[PDB]
Design a protein around this nucleic acid. Sequence first.
DNA 1: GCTCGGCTCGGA
DNA 2: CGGCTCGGA
Lengths: 151, 154
Amino acid sequence: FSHEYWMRHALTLAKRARDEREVPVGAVLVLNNRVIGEGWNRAIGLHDPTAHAEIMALRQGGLVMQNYRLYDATLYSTFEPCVMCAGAMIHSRIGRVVFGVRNAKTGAAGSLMDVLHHPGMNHRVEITEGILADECAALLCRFFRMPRRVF
Amino acid sequence: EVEFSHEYWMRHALTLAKRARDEREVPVGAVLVLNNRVIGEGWNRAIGLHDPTAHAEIMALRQGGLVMQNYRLYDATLYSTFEPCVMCAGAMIHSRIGRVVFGVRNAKTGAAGSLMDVLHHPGMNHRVEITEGILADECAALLCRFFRMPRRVF
DNA sequence: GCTCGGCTCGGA
DNA sequence: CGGCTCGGA
Ligand SMILES: [Zn+2]
Ligand SMILES: [Zn+2]
């Protein structure tokens, strides 16, 4: 079970959000090489500003583990987390975040800002990028009607 | 057409903050107002629901999106009893609200001018105004007994 | 109709 | 009660 193996599962959930006319982003929560949470974007269909892929995966992980704090967990998302999504990882105290393509415009994981690696914060989450970034950019490109070169 | 003040809506957010205090949670309350009309209510429910996103401001934003049938809430004002965190402040940018009114400041991990300022960060698509110091004396009394701290920290 | 506008939902 | 803004604050 490599990072690309778990990313292939997150890409499957991202296709479900694409069929629901949402942002094609998928997220899966892994703890000790096992899935504990799944999530995909459902903001437009559910009228929820927090119905992102990573939030729904974090919401599901807290229910199965019966604890809103998920220590030493690794989340596999297809997009760079936003300020809202990155803030939930600090509250969940997860271990590592693996995203594919970077949001060079409003990214909160080292692009526009870096809240996951802030010194004044109480928790530090490691970041790993470039995992299956070719297949993650192809979905977001057709959604925003953008070329694959901006990624 | 009646216009209420910031302290009037803050007194309602203090009522919801007592509900989170009774649920053994962080005594924080939040209420969403649009054109002097309540569209969302929220208090901390992270421990009871096992939800890392069950904060006071998030649950109030989830209620506003359901009543308005739109995850974007323009020209809306949120009345919270605590300084919003990085997660809550990021949700306000996604909801495109107009103004956030909080009571006491989180001098440690505040995201509304303390540790960071994401509502007034350059390069973002939306800018939300912040109003502070509204009924901060009564908001600190609830969080003080929760964290077992004196009133001199806030 | 002649691959929408300007670009990381349509207040991107 | 510990030590500070849940108990890994
Ligand atoms: Zn996000
Ligand atoms: Zn918060």
